[PDB]
Amino acid sequence: IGQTAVPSVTQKKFLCDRVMWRIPFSSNFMSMGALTDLGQNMLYANSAHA
Amino acid sequence: VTTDRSQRLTLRFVPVDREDTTYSYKARFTLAVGDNRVLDMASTYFDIRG
Amino acid sequence: VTTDRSQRLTLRFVPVDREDTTYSYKARFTLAVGDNRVLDMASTYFDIRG
Amino acid sequence: SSETNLTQQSMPNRPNYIGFRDNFVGLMYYNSTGNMGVLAGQASQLNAVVDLQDRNTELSYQLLLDSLGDRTRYFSMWNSAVDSYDPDVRIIENHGVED
Amino acid sequence: LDMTFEVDPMDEPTLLYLLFEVFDVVRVHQPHRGVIEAVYLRTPFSAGN
Amino acid sequence: LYPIPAKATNVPISIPSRNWAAFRGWSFTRLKTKETPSLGSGFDPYFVYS
Amino acid sequence: GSIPYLDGTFYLNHTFKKVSIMFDSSVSWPGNDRLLTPNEFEIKRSVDG
Incomplete structure (x- = not known):
């Protein structure tokens, strides 16, 4: 800062801590119901997946 | 509800042209909406770096 | 076998859009295959100068 | 500058040829879905490319050319000139010298 | 499928490059002016589900 | 690719x-x-070889 | 001290960088060309050209 300000570089970061990260298994990531559309595709898929 | 064809959620457009003056900047974009898309403009924004 | 009409052998398309960046270059072309023609994509290539 | 520094000695710098890769491999992005190429009907606007991460277009193209032609013939337009080595340098084959 | 390889030690990190040979095919339909429909099927290790 | x-x-x-x-x-x-670049990214800062 | 596992008082989430998800093999889950990096949830970037 000021008229003698030293050459400088920027650090960007974040927090969010009471959260835990979520990924909906849903064909678009919205909540459209509790039993998602992909969760129903996997019923009529009748097959095992790893 | 959701398409099973290969398509992006977010599209990033680039200035097809830009002009500068001593006090302002002006950029032109071809915002394209494909035949089976619809775009709510409230989802659009100018991402600027400098 | 061959058309008597005035028509090019080679078409050159400049980018309609481009994006030079930190570690990549991007470009978009409107590859207009005109009427009463066919294009073999083996004919196509990007003529880079730099 | 000194009488002992007259006795410096030099060795030439190691050769280091730099150029574009064979067939321009590495110049374009392939099998990299964050940076995928696009070919779409301009009205339809949906990309026909649909590339994958566990695909290797560059190696697939290298193998294709060896089946289609003779890689020992260089061709400047596509920068085609296959990588090699001197076989007498890979396998030393030391018959001594005729002295 | 389980696989196992025995190899000479290298003293530096290396990668086993393993290619599962499959079919990897496309069919391209152009029904109208300026329209491309393309259908992909790799098999086995089909990449869509 | 298995390490x-x-x-x-x-x-x-x-x-x-x-x-x-x-x-x-x-x-x-x-x-x-060291003789294998990562293709999953735009750039690979650890690909320190040519 | 607190037991975040047991009582929900999490932190340390900023330490994730990316997630990649793949069914069977070859089926990258997230979807078909969806995300700006289609088959990884990249949470944060150290370099971002």
Whole structure:
């Protein structure tokens, strides 16, 4: 800062801590119901997946 | 509800042209909406770096 | 076998859009295959100068 | 500058040829879905490319050319000139010298 | 499928490059002016589900 | 690409239960890690080799 | 001290960088060309050209 300000570089970061990260298994990531559309595709898929 | 064809959620457009003056900047974009898309403009924004 | 009409052998398309960046270059072309023609994509290539 | 520094000695710098890769491999992005190429009907606007991460277009193209032609013939337009080595340098084959 | 390889030690990190040979095919339909429909099927290790 | 740690003489790998209809066989070879760039990113800052 | 596992008082989430998800093999889950990096949830970037 000021008229003698030293050459400088920027650090960007974040927090969010009471959260835990979520990924909906849903064909678009919205909540459209509790039993998602992909969760129903996997019923009529009748097959095992790893 | 959701398409099973290969398509992006977010599209990033680039200035097809830009002009500068001593006090302002002006950029032109071809915002394209494909035949089976619809775009709510409230989802659009100018991402600027400098 | 061959058309008597005035028509090019080679078409050159400049980018309609481009994006030079930190570690990549991007470009978009409107590859207009005109009427009463066919294009073999083996004919196509990007003529880079730099 | 000194009488002992007259006795410096030099060795030439190691050769280091730099150029574009064979067939321009590495110049374009392939099998990299964050940076995928696009070919779409301009009205339809949906990309026909649909590339994958566990695909290797560059190696697939290298193998294709060896089946289609003779890689020992260089061709400047596509920068085609296959990588090699001197076989007498890979396998030393030391018959001594005729002295 | 389980696989196992025995190899000479290298003293530096290396990668086993393993290619599962499959079919990897496309069919391209152009029904109208300026329209491309393309259908992909790799098999086995089909990449869509 | 499966990693082989420095000085490791054994590399066991598996794929879980799946179909094998139209399978053709296996091809395999060995690569150095420093002689292999990551293709999953725009740039690979650890690809310190040419 | 607190037991975040047991009582929901999490932190340390900023330490994730990316997630990649793949069914069977080859089926990258997230979807078909969806995300700006289609088959990884990249949470944060150290370099971002």
